[PDB]
Structures are given as C-alpha cells and as structure tokens.
C-alpha cells in the first residue's frame, strides 16, 4: 500500500479503445437505478469506480420529477464499479453533494462534496470516508468544483474550485490536499478568464487542467501547476474549438474566443507538447455527438487543421459532459500515465418531453494499437411510463 | 485488532458538517426499501453503519399497513452501510427486536435486541452475531432500551434499560457488558426522574447519557457513570428546553420542568464543562425542524441565553428522533473522541394521511472548521400509491 | 483453518432465545424473494447460513403457480446469510436439487443435492462448490435426504438417505463422507421402522438423528451412531408425541405409535440422557403452532408428564417443518456444542387459497439464562396480488 | 497465486452430473434480470463464473424489444457467479461487446470483447480489467470469436477468431496471449473449411477446439494446436452428426458433410483417442433437446454406432448454444483436467411469439460415478406481460 508517484509522462496514444458502457437509462426503465447527472470515473491502484451525483430518486418514479434542477438537499455523491448501473443495491455512499470531486492517492479515497445554500455553500472533504476538512464559499455565490477526478502526485492531491458568477468574472482557487486536509491554496489571477468544471490530470509531477469558460469563450481555458501551486494560465489556441456551443472551426485564439462563447459544457483535452487530443461534441450548437481529434499543433497554434478524428457518438445522438481520467502505472504496470475519458449521455429535459433528466455513461482508454470509430449512444426510448 | 481505549476527551466543536443522507422514503416509492423507524448510527474501527428496526415489510406494499404500531413479532434489528437505503438486498440481519442498541468494542459488534410480550420481554445480547446473554424484564412492563449506540471503554460496553410505566415512575438500570456478557448492573435510585431512550457516549473513560423524560420533564435528564457503574444523575439546567413537546424558552431548572413535560422525543446533547451542545426540534409542539445550539453555561445554568445556533431541518419539515454517535481515535487518527449525531425524519402516521409510518435519516460530524446552516429534509411526496 | 472436533457434549439448556426471523413472505409481496420450501440453518466456524430449496420462481409472479408440487427440474438448493430474505440478489447457488442436506466440516462446505427422475434420482455431493461424488437411487423410488444439516465430527460428516415407499417399509442408509467423498455406508436393519427427513447432530463424537415415521408412527424414530457407523435404533418413548399428526398425549411406546401414525412432518429433538427437548406443533392434527417441551424422562419413559413448556408459535398460526442445528465451540468459544433449532412457517397451499406454496423461517438457540414464550408467526396477509 | 499448468490429460468420464441451473427467464418474469444470449462458463482456481452478452436491457421491459438482433452498441459482456441469475445487482462489468471470450490463467482474468461496426470491428483485450491489447478486423466482415472460454496452458491463453462470410469461405486465426498481450498469431490454411464459435479446451499442454461450420457442414470442424500454434485441422468423422440442422444419422465423413450443412449452432465435443463425447440437440432441424453421446470410435470413424446416450433436455423443449468448460487440477485437486459443459436454453424469437429473445442456462461436470438422464428445461411460460 503505497502513494502514487505521479512522475512519469502521459502515454503516447494513437486512438481510443472502448472501456465501459453502463446502459443506465435503458435498465432504469424497469430496474431500480438512480436518477443521476455529473458522473465521472476515477481509479485506485486496484479498481476503477464511477462516481455520480444522485437526485435522491429512482428512474421511472414520481420523485424523478423536476430533476432538471441542479442543486437541492437531496443530491448525494455515490459511487459504483465501472460499467455497472448506479443502483441503491450496488452503490457506496460518499457525501451529501450537489458538486463534487474525488481521487485516490494510492492509500485512500479523497472525496469532496459541496452542499448547503447558494449563498454559503460548504465543501466537506473526506479521506477514507472520514471528515477531514471543510471549506466554505468565499464569494457567497455557488461554491463549486470539478465534477471529475482530482489529481494526485506523491501523496498530494489537487483540485480547482470556483465561486462567483457563471456569466461574468468569477474567483478561481487551486488547492493542495494531503490525507484530506487542505495544506495550501492560491487564488488564480485570471482577469478576463472564466474557469468552470476543470478536468485535471497529472503528467510528469505537474497538474494540467482543461476547463469550461461559461462567460465568453468557445475555446477552453487551461491552468497548469506544480506541487507548490506555481501556476500558468492560457486558452487552447486551436481553431478546432472545444466548447459547446461554439462557431464552425476557423482561425482560433490563445485568448477567449467570444463568438458563441457564453454558456458551455464540461469537457477535457490532453496536452502533448504543442499538440492536443480534443474531445468535443459533434454539434456546434447542442449537446449532441462526440468525437476525438488529434491536432499536432493545437495547444499553441491557431489554425483549424487537424490530423486524426475518431467518432465516439453520432451527431444525431445525445451526449453531455465529458472528463478525463488516468490510470497510473501502479495500476497498469506500464511506464507512463495512461490517459482515458468518459462521456455523459444526458436524457430528458430540457431537450426531451419528460419530467426528469438523467444520464448514462461510456468510457475509453488511450492505446497505440488499432482502434475504430463508431457510435455508442444512450439507447433508451423516451418518454418513459412516468412521463 | 484492538479494543477501543475510550480514554481521550470529546473533541472541541464549533459546528456540524453534513456526513450522510439516505433519502430512504423517496427511494422506497419505487425501490425495495424497508419500512423502518428508530434508526441509529454506530462505528467500528473500520466503518460506520446504520442500524434500524424494520417492520418486516417494504415501503409501498400492503404489509406496511398499521406500522404506527410500536411492538410486534415481525420487527427486526438490521444494519447497512451509512448513507445507503435499508433494503433486503444490502442489509445484514442482527436480531429479532422491537427495541435495540448496538456498539463495537474494537474487536466485535455487540447487539442488544428486545422481543417477546409486553409483560415479559427478553433482551438477547449477541457478540459477533452469536448469542452471549439474555436479560428478562424485571417489572413486567415493556423492558426497553436506547434506540441508539451503546458506549465502549477499554473492552467494556455500557447501556441503560427501562422497565415500568411511560407516564409515571419507572425503573432504570445500567449495565456493563464484556464480550456480550453482562458483568455488572445497578438500578439507578432516581425517584421523581424518568429515563427513556438514552443517548450515551464515552468521554475520558466515563459514560454520559442524555435521555427522554416522558412523564413530567420538558428538559432532558442525564446520567453519567464510571466503569464500576458509580453514577450521578440530574437534568440539563438550560432554559433552552431540549424535549418535544416543551414550552417556549424561559428560565430552566435542574430538576424536571413540568410545563409541557408529559410525552417526549428521543434526543441527545453533548456536555463540555458547564456548556452544552443541544440538538432539538424547532417546533415546541410537534416533531418538526431541527437545530443545534451551543449554550456555554447550559448544562448547569438556568438562563435561556445561547451563543450559536445552526439550522439542520426547517421548521416546516418533518423531523423525529435524534441521537449521538462517536468516532473514536482508533477510526479517525485524531487525539480526541469526535462527537457526531443523526436525525430520523419521520414520514406518515400520525401526522400524514397514510397507512404507514417510516423514516429516513441524516447525520453530521462535529468539526472546528467552517460550517453552514441549511435544511436537509426527507423530501418524499406523500401519500404514496399504496395509500 | 481447522476441522471441527465434535467431541464435547451438548450444552445444558433451560430455554430458547430467539436468534432469527426473515419475514420472507411479507417482504416477497413486493420484493424479489424466491418461492421456497424446506429451509434449514447450518453454520461454519465463521457464520450461519440459511439453505433452502427454491422453486425457480419468485413470490407474486405467475411462475409461482403450482408450487405445491415437490419435485421438478427447476428446484435448486441455494443459501443466504441467516435472517435475510432469500433473493436472487443475495443468494449463493449450491446445487440443482429437490432434496438436500449441507454442513461445514471446519474447512469447507459439503452440499448434497438430489435431482433427476423419481425412478432413478442422483445425489450430487459438492465440497467447496466442486463435484466430489455421486450416489444413485438403489430402490428406484425417490432417493431423498434430510432437508436439514448433516453432522460433522473430526473431518467426517454424516447423513441419512431413504429410498422406497413413503407409506410402507422402505430402505434407510447412513453415510460417512470425507472431503465430499463417500468413504463408508451401511443399510440400517430396521424392519417395521420408517425414517424420513432426519435431523442429526453431533454429541461427544457420535451422531444422533431424530426423524419422521410417515408410515405408522406418531412418535419419532431415532438412529444414533459412531464414526464407524455402528448404529442403534429406537423410537422416542414419551407420551408427549412428537409427530404431526398425532393423538392427544397419553401413555407412549418405545416402538411406533400406530394411532394417527400415517403421514407426518419433519422435526427434531435433543437427547440428554433419559430426557428430551421435544419441538412440536401445537395442533395434534395440522401444521399449526410450535412449542418446546422438556421431558426429563421422555427419551426412554412412556408417561405423558413433562416439566417445561415454552411457546414458539401460537396454535392459530401456520408452522411447518423444523430441524436442529448446532453451533460448535470453534464458532462460539464455549466448552460444549450448542443446540439450536429452526421452524419453517408454511404459507399457501394446501390450507390457503393461493396458486403457490412458500415458507418463511424463525430460529432459536439454547441458553441457560432467562427466556420467554411468545408467538413469532409468518405474518403475511394472503392471498397475494397474483392469486 | 500460480499459473495453471495445463499439462495433465482430460479426466476419463462415464457420464455427466448436473452442476448448475439459473432459471433466469422464469425469475426475470418479475425480477430484474438481463436479457442475454451467448452465455458461457469459465473458472479460476477459486470460483466458476457465468459470462454472457447482455442486450443492455431487462426482461419484461420495453427495451428488450428487438433483441433477436445480434450486434448493437448496447451489448456488454458481464459475468456473475455460476447458477445465479444475471442481474444488474450481482453482475460484474467486463467489456463492451457483441462477441466475446474469457479465461483465467491462474493469476488473472483475460476478457476479449469485440464491438464497433461490421466493417471494422475491434477486439478489446483486458487482463485484470485493464486494457492490454486490441486487434482489428482484417477482412472487414464481422470480426468474431468463440462465445465460450479461451484455453490456458502455462501462462499462455489461446483463442480463435473468424472474419469473413458466414455462408462461404472465411478467414480463421489462432492467437496466443500472455498477460493480455497478443504474442503470436497465425492464419489457419483451411480451404473448404468453415470455423465459427469454437469451443476450445486444454489437454496435455495442447489445445483442441470443436467449432461450427455455418457454410456446408452438418458435422463439426476441429482445430488442434500446440503452444507455438502449430496446428492440425479436420472434421469429426462420426455418422452421429453434431450440428443443428443436420441429416438423420448415417455414414459420416471426415470432411464437411454437405447434407443440411448450411447454418448451424455453437457446440462442443471432447476427444479421447479415436473416441468422442458429442453434445448435440435432439431435433435434427431446430434447437430443441440436448443429449450427450459417447461414441468410442467417432473422432476418426464414420459409422453411426455409439455406446452411451445420456438425456439432458427433452426433444420437445428449447435448447440452444452449448460449450465446453474445464476445471483444472489447481481448482479441484484432481490429477487430470475435468471436462464440463453448459447449455443455453433460448426463449423467445424466432420460434415464439414475443418481442424479445433471451436465454437461461444449465451445466454439467464429467464424473466416473453414477449418473442419470433427465430433462432440465428452461421452464418459463411465454409470452410475458411485455409481449
Ligand atoms: C390497510 O388497513 C385498513 C384497515 O383494515 C384497510 O382499510 C379497510 O379496508 C377494509 C376492506 O376494504 C374495509 O372493511 C370493510 O368496511 C365496510 C364498511 O366501511 C364493511 O361493510 C365491510 O364488511 C363487509 O365485507 C366483508 C367481506 O366481504 C364481510 O366479511 C363483512 O361481514 C361485510 O359484508 C368491510 O369490513 C374498511 O372499511 C377499511 N377501513 C378504513 C379505515 O379505510 C386498508 O384497505 C388496508 N390497505 C392495504 C393496502 O392493506
Ligand atoms: C416493440 O416494437 C414493435 C415494433 O416497432 C412495436 O409494435 C408496433 O407498435 C407501433 C405503435 O403502436 C405500431 O405503429 C403503428 O402502426 C400503425 C398501423 O398498424 C400506424 O397507423 C401508426 O402510425 C400512425 O401513428 C403515428 C403516431 O401517432 C404517426 O406518426 C403515423 O404517421 C400514423 O398516423 C404506427 O406506425 C406498429 O403497428 C406495431 N408493429 C407491430 C408489428 O405490432 C411494439 O409496440 C413494441 N413494444 C414495446 C413494448 O416496446
Ligand atoms: C453554477 C455554475 C455551473 C457551471 C457553469 O452550472 C452547472 C452547469 C450545468 C450544465 O451546464 O449542465 C449543470 C451543473 N450541475 C451546474 N452546476 C451547479 C453546481 O449547479
Ligand atoms: C414504551 C415507551 C417508549 C418510550 C417513551 O415508547 C416509545 C415511543 C415512541 C415515540 O414516541 O415515537 C416510539 C418507540 N418505538 C416506543 N418504544 C417502544 C419500545 O414501544
Ligand atoms: C417423498 C417422501 C417425502 C417424505 C415423507 O415427502 C416429502 C414431504 C413433504 C411434506 O410432507 O410437506 C414435502 C417434501 N418436499 C417431500 N419430499 C420430497 C423429496 O418430495
Ligand atoms: C456472424 C456469424 C455468426 C456465426 C455464424 O452469427 C452468430 C449466430 C447466431 C445464432 O446462430 O444464433 C447468434 C450470434 N450472436 C451470431 N454472432 C454474431 C457475432 O453476430
Ligand atoms: C519516479 O518516482 C519513482 C518512485 O519513487 C522513482 O523511483 C523514479 O526515480 C522516478 N521516475 C522518473 C524520474 O521517471
Ligand atoms: C411534477 O411536479 C409539479 C410541481 O410539484 C406538479 O405540479 C406535477 O403534477 C408533477 N407531475 C408529475 C407527473 O409527477
Ligand atoms: C514525496 O514526498 C515525500 C514526503 O513523504 C518527500 O519526502 C519526498 O522527497 C517527495 N518525493 C518527490 C519525488 O518529490
Ligand atoms: C489512553 O490509553 C492508551 C492506550 O492504552 C494509553 O497508551 C494512554 O496512556 C492513555 N492516555 C491517557 C491520557 O490515559
Ligand atoms: C476434544 O478434541 C480436542 C481437539 O483435538 C482435544 O484436544 C481434547 O482432548 C478433546 N476433548 C475432550 C475429551 O473433552
Ligand atoms: C396455473 O396453472 C394452470 C396449469 O397450467 C393454469 O391452467 C392456470 O391458468 C394458472 N393460473 C394462474 C393464475 O397463473
Ligand atoms: C481424527 O482424525 C485424524 C485424521 O486426520 C486421526 O489421525 C485422529 O486420530 C482422529 N482424532 C480423534 C480424536 O478421533
Ligand atoms: C506438469 O507441470 C507441473 C507443474 O510445474 C510439473 O511439476 C509436472 O512435472 C508436470 N508433469 C508432467 C507430466 O508434465
Ligand atoms: Ca463557453
Ligand atoms: Ca492545427
Ligand atoms: Ca417530556
Ligand atoms: Ca445559557
Ligand atoms: Ca422491482
Ligand atoms: Ca407419522
Ligand atoms: Ca415424562
Ligand atoms: Ca452447419
Ligand atoms: Ca461409432
């Protein structure tokens, strides 16, 4: 039982091999499956788990009514084994939460679950299931976090939280956590940037996060930092815009791209020097489809050329959030940190005529062997009996 | 594998961080969730479990009919992991019981489950799931116990049991138990006192219990004792009255407060010198709302002044029983015993137009970091299909 | 990990403390609970399990139709933790079977499951879940076994099987089994005796079985034997008759009591020298009620006097099969083998107007501390939705 | 924790003892049971598991509609303990797949799950749940594999895959896999042969596979090979034809038997010198009944004589796929590899008037002790509520 080192580089990847699919919404038509959104995957040295925010209700029951609503006292962070449906009969209780993050340092699970009122929310940090720290809203305006895994390097785990407007300048802080206790934090000095829902991973002892600008950017902002929280900030420069909504691909910017910049979706990308692996929706205007694109100069260069595209979900099918996750060498036995990703397939409101909103999930792992594009969509037939 | 020492003091706490919420009644609208009441939490050195008294029936099924009834041969003590719904598919069987207690000494679980007729009930003690002792009613009038966790100190666990009227003078005994065997007991000499449903915890090698006077007290009675069962008794002196029902706050007493004193609700409080942390309903007349109040002189002083109030459940929402539980240093790695508490959110009869009565639960742990008041209510929409 | 010794004597017991209740039929009204009959309890050095014969169907589903029928290719022997309902979601698969036995030698589980046609049935023996032996019908007329636990002493386990008529002279064999392999067997020379459904236990290195005479006895036959299968046979002499049906209590016999002797119910008794602890129905004519009676001279003496009766299930409530089980000192830490028992509470056909037949269960352990009589019946309201 | 040697011979068997029956379809009428087909069994040194291809849907739910369809993005490989129903509450997620294989090398599980489009499908290999390799379609025409267990010998596991037409000459490759990585492969040079759905087992350090000719053979093709993938090929010569459909028994061939040769069913056989144990349907024209036949010269001789037949499923009852599985000496403690087999009992479309297709399963292990013929059919009553 040993701390993850986090000191090897990301593995080189040519393509993405399908890892899991839970079919949660299809199964929940009959079975006892939680209404969920904001799922994410995180791994220990022994296993991979799906974390998710329940709505304290099951699919196809009357208590799923009104689950478009983001924040309530009923929402809880729970987890289950990867690829299994999230049920009351197979899910571990983690925290009371309407925003969350989680990660394993090699020894125990850290979970961060935020609840409370919009004007004074509190993040509750747990290590091995025991409360180890709290942090309260510092701008009194919806303290919130990643909705994907935190990142760990040599016994320290790292996350980003936001507090303030979702449609204007807000406040962004980076945290270093050891055994569930906050040991350091810093406010990012990012005037004119907007960071929401960061997808962070370790690479060569440093953390890279690719986030959502909900204010005025259709490209994604990034922040990277070392273990002392010395950071750098920027936006992905590629004209292959990564947010949803966005414009058609054209010449990009290393600052926020204003065209179609308001609103957004949680997402991710993996940096390889000047290059980038971008996961994005297929539709420029809606949460539909998903694809992976390799742009060899897209981290720093503004053209809209790219070299590989792999289809994940077809343009006519519902998608949603996505996030990164990694598998450390302590799990895989490889000599590098393996990049992986998950996609939330959102069903229900606002786009479909149901009383509820819920998601299923798919995930993929990066490989250098042969792969293929396809579409692996949610597959449920809506509406349901309850609607 | 080592016995809990129980020799450190209670941790100092400024406020309460949310720890769990099971949403049992919401989920049970569709899922297979036991009808339960009298839930409580207790921890080992490895995990925290919810114990509860089933009615041998599931929510939204005809066998939930008439579950306002307290004692039957169908009620069982069972347990599940904290925060999970109590289902037949995730719950461990403990004992046949219509009143119960349980606690872990560091090595194994002790459960105490009382069943049989009102005029001759028998407590069955189990250690590691094996029957180790029994004790039979000594006044032939509903032998009954805590409905929350027993308290353990250096291999010995301690509980309190009552036998006799619920509306006049009864008989109260303290027990010391080792490996599931009663090794000592004493009858408390408490004329004019009434003790029901004690919430007991360890603090510096001694046990303190805060209980319910169902006869003629709207403040709570207490009993404290050492390992040889040498005890002291009194009532909480604060004019911040702890029971439900109760009068509006005014000058208190350190005997039983007769105004609104008949009837009651199980509750708890934590003593810190002359001060007290009081958990109570918000309503003076019904089991609605919940709040935590820090009164720095409330154990021994009679004024109705207090320094901190933290909201837990809104005044218009259903609450119910509450109890203490602790997390020992052997679980947390701290240097003190961490006080925590649970609240039962009772749904159905007598206050709502259903055929059934059941509860869900919430819990909190004491911290010295930032916290916030809110309302985390049950959230089910009654009546149900079966009603 | 060590073989059970089986060499200490049965513990002296004054009365019976309630150990489990599963409420299976009440829960199965909504939940996913197997239709079962012929349940029984057996323990390892670490835990106690409920074994049972499913009908390959769930309660309140159409496939429960016709489950009065004893033998089919759908019946399977499965097991779950004691006191939990038998569900597809918590039950371990053991064997394909319409008659069964099971026991733990201290190292692994032995299961014996008989299936096949009436004219050529085969017992499949499994040790640690792996097929270790078979034995085929030797009279071609419903090879059948205990429906309760086998008995183990120093690495050998022992059982009894019958083949031939249920209403006349049949053939009875005793088996010694080591690591799932039959190492010895003998045919009992018992002209004019009838043995069905033996309840066997260890006591001081020897096995005692108390069985059902379905031909012409309203008292119970017994067989006892050592590890070399040197046996003795008799009938319980007490005028406190043990079978169902039976006459009113009167002077008994050490041979089969012909009055009301045909038909029967599986049951048990525990021998203490000349004395006996008898479990029986309360009704002389029907499977209703249950009671424990201590008759200090009832093993060898024919009077109808007895000294203790303890009520278990009221005379107006449904009962059914019962059987012995033991808890070895390797489990309990005691210096003797603890006698325990279980009762099957049969619901449905033939006595009630349902399409199905199923049972729930209760169990008790022998103690020398205080106990009480009561009634702990099944408690389901019949008929069900499906009927 | 040690690799399976795989160097002992197959155990001699006189007959087949029933090992498991899951009753999945019966139970799924009410319970939450996956729609599945292509089940198979495989064992580790500690346990036996059922693997299966879900349709991402539950029985008696609308999403079971159209499950006659073989390949979709919703199908997943999952596994549960042998004999238990495949539910979302007891099943481990393995891979996204519409064709699969799995096997344990003594240390960890290998799973192979093929998904993607018909013209470019990709097999994802996982070792201990971690992606270790991929292989992509080489003829762009439904890359596909065994639907039963792979075979392991001294740390290397072996499988066969087909790519190309199901009704004419296709391409067949053998693979050697170590810790989930392909280390060797070879294309079989088998003009005029057709290999689908191979049932492979180890015997004396070499692998033998018995497969389905879907093009023009009513007898079964075989391939056998050593660890360096040096192979031999032929067809089972017995006039006791093994496929379904097939002609009535008559003089056979050791090439493909053209009469009734098109189409087929997955099956198996076990070679013992010149002899063979053949599992087959009872019907020559449809997937009904099942029987085991010992033909002492049937591997290499063409007559239609045989020595032993054991009934498994009656001629009027539904059967389906069948496959081999083995129990190694490391699991059993025997000195030889124990042959066992499973049968899929297919319910629904095309033969029955439902919207869905699913199966249940039975399994048997080879013994030299007494056995018996019977019928252990599926037993569900179709149609269901949803139909
Ligand atoms: C939960 O429990 C409640 C309480 O038992 C139950 O509600 C009751 O349902 C029964 C059956 O519908 C009702 O009983 C009837 O009452 C009427 C008068 O109101 C009588 O006329 C009926 O008696 C006639 O019918 C019987 C059978 O045919 C005859 O035996 C009898 O002699 C009469 O001819 C019968 O007593 C009862 O009124 C209600 N009570 C209330 C308060 O609603 C409820 O249905 C249960 N729910 C579930 C889901 O279990
Ligand atoms: C399982 O799948 C089957 C196959 O899809 C499904 O059975 C089908 O149900 C649908 C809906 O009831 C039927 O479709 C209708 O067919 C009639 C003629 O028979 C048409 O007139 C209907 O079209 C009208 O209505 C539509 C909606 O209002 C309009 O969009 C349309 O333009 C028309 O006005 C409609 O197409 C279909 O006939 C059956 N098919 C069969 C073979 O039974 C079944 O219900 C599914 N079951 C479950 C549980 O999912
Ligand atoms: C409050 C800002 C935040 C990020 C833009 O909105 C999120 C957007 C969401 C969305 O765009 O789907 C759903 C999230 N559950 C919500 N987060 C919270 C904490 O309410
Ligand atoms: C019998 C006295 C006792 C304490 C006042 O009543 C309790 C009150 C209850 C209550 O006030 O809600 C419910 C408890 N289940 C009941 N206890 C038992 C054993 O019946
Ligand atoms: C076949 C004789 C046997 C013992 C008398 O009948 C049993 C009686 C039964 C009974 O009296 O309830 C139910 C048992 N399931 C049945 N056993 C079998 C194997 O069918
Ligand atoms: C595609 C050829 C293949 C072997 C003949 O067809 C199989 C026949 C089937 C069958 O005959 O029942 C069902 C299998 N699920 C299918 N395999 C796939 C991958 O689709
Ligand atoms: C990474 O950390 C490991 C584990 O402590 C260390 O042994 C090794 O030198 C480092 N790897 C590099 C520099 O690639
Ligand atoms: C959904 O909730 C709203 C608000 O309480 C209510 O008015 C409506 O009837 C509900 N609908 C259903 C179908 O449950
Ligand atoms: C990792 O942290 C430990 C603290 O246990 C520290 O002593 C060590 O130097 C760190 N290692 C690296 C490679 O930074
Ligand atoms: C508490 O008990 C521990 C464990 O035995 C002991 O080592 C320690 O001295 C005790 N401390 C006090 C202050 O009693
Ligand atoms: C019982 O067997 C034990 C275990 O081997 C042995 O040590 C002991 O002598 C025996 N007990 C008796 C005779 O009571
Ligand atoms: C019970 O089974 C019989 C025999 O198949 C059948 O005729 C009857 O309709 C069934 N009844 C129900 C209610 O399922
Ligand atoms: C128990 O059986 C063993 C076989 O391992 C034998 O050698 C030993 O003598 C037996 N002990 C008793 C007490 O009979
Ligand atoms: C089989 O392999 C085992 C395990 O390595 C070895 O000890 C044994 O000699 C082998 N036997 C034969 C006959 O190859
Ligand atoms: Ca944006
Ligand atoms: Ca570019
Ligand atoms: Ca009171
Ligand atoms: Ca005060
Ligand atoms: Ca259900
Ligand atoms: Ca009889
Ligand atoms: Ca007598
Ligand atoms: Ca063919
Ligand atoms: Ca032949």
UniProtKB/TrEMBL annotation, chains A, B, C, D:
Region described as Head of neuraminidase: spans on this chain: 10-387
Active site per the UniProt annotation: 70, 321
Modification after translation (UniProt): N-glycosylated.
Entry's Gene Ontology molecular function annotations: exo-alpha-sialidase activity; metal ion binding
Presence of keyword RNA-binding: no
Methyltransferase found in the keyword field: no
Co-factor requirement: Ca(2+)
Keywords, ordered alphabetically: Calcium, Disulfide bond, Glycoprotein, Glycosidase, Host cell membrane, Host membrane, Hydrolase, Membrane, Metal-binding, Signal-anchor, Transmembrane, Transmembrane helix, Virion
GO terms, biological process: carbohydrate metabolic process; viral budding from plasma membrane
Catalytic activity: Hydrolysis of alpha-(2->3)-, alpha-(2->6)-, alpha-(2->8)- glycosidic linkages of terminal sialic acid residues in oligosaccharides, glycoproteins, glycolipids, colominic acid and synthetic substrates
Descriptive protein name: Neuraminidase
Name of the gene: NA
């Amino acid at each position: 039982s040993v701390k993850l080192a986090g000191n090897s580089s990301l593995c080189p990847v040519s393509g993405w091999a399908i890892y899991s699919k839970d079919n949660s919404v299809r199964i929940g038509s009959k079975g006892d499956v939680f209404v969920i959104r904001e799922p994410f995957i995180s791994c220990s040295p022994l296993e991979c788990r799906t974390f998710f925010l329940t709505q304290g209700a099951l699919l196809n029951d009357k208590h799923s009514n009104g689950t478009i609503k983001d924040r309530s006292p009923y929402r809880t962070l729970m987890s289950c084994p990867i690829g299994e449906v999230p049920s009351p009969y197979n899910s571990r209780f983690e925290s009371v939460a309407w925003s969350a993050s989680a990660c394993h340092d090699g020894i125990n699970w850290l979970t961060i679950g935020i609840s409370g009122p919009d004007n004074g929310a509190v993040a509750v940090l747990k290590y091995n299931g025991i409360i180890t720290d709290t942090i309260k809203s510092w701008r009194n305006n919806i303290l919130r976090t990643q909705e994907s895994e935190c990142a760990c390097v040599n016994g320290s785990c790292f996350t980003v939280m936001t507090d303030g407007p979702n449609n204007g300048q807000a406040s962004y802080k980076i945290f270093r956590i050891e055994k569930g206790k906050i040991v350091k934090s810093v406010e990012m000095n990012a005037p004119n940037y907007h960071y929401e829902e960061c997808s962070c991973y370790p690479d060569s002892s440093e953390i890279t996060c690719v986030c959502r600008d909900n204010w005025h950017g259709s490209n994604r902002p990034w922040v990277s930092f070392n273990q002392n929280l010395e950071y750098q900030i920027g936006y992905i420069c590629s004209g292959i815009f990564g947010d949803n909504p966005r414009p058609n691909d054209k010449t990009g910017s290393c600052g926020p791209v204003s065209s179609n910049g308001a609103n957004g979706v949680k997402g991710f990308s993996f940096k390889y020097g000047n290059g980038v692996w971008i996961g994005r929706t297929k539709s420029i205007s809606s949460r539909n489809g998903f694809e992976m694109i390799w742009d060899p100069n897209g981290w720093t260069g503004t053209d809209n050329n790219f070299s590989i595209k792999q289809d994940i979900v077809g343009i006519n099918e519902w998608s949603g959030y996505s996030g990164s996750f990694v598998q450390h060498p302590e799990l895989t036995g490889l000599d590098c940190i393996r990049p992986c990703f998950w996609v939330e397939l959102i069903r229900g409101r606002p786009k479909e005529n149901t009383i509820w909103t819920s998601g299923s999930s798919i995930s993929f792992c990066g490989v250098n062997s042969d792969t293929v594009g396809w579409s692996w969509p949610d597959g449920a037939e809506l509406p349901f009996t309850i609607d």
